[PDB]
Write a protein that binds this ligand. Structure first.
Ligand code: FES
Length: 128
């Protein structure tokens, strides 16, 4: 069960694409902040955010006051498991590739996803 994490910020700075230049593959040819890009490996069933949090991987805990269901990531390929669901929408995982990484585990073997989505512009304005 391995999941490749890629800093969403490196996507803009490097000016690359998510699936065009295969950043997950081209990033290995350069050498960006290991904490930004790299292949994550966690046992199946272990909360990804936690398994990676032990290696130093940080995540924008987008947990609001009173329940929650909108962390901040972008699965580049693969599926993730998590508690029940209803508010979220498939269109969000297909058009935004976002999902739950805090207490969510990997549903497939090799799954790619962008970390630190907080940089997104859909939230940058609501940062303060
Ligand atoms: S930000 Fe609340 S469960 Fe992830």
């Amino acid at each position: 069960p391995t999941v490749e994490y890629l800093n969403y910020e490196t996507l803009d700075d490097q000016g690359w694409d998510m699936d065009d230049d295969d950043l997950f593959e081209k990033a290995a040819d350069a050498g960006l902040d290991g904490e930004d890009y790299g292949t994550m490996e966690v046992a199946e069933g272990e909360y990804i955010l936690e398994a990676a949090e032990a290696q130093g991987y940080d995540w924008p805990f987008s947990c609001r006051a009173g329940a929650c269901a909108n962390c901040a990531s972008i699965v580049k390929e693969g599926e993730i498991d998590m508690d029940m669901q209803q508010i979220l929408s498939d269109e969000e995982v297909e058009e935004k590739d976002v999902r739950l990484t805090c207490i969510g585990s990997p549903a497939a073997d090799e799954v790619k996803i962008v970390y630190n989505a907080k940089h997104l512009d859909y939230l940058q304005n609501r940062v303060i």
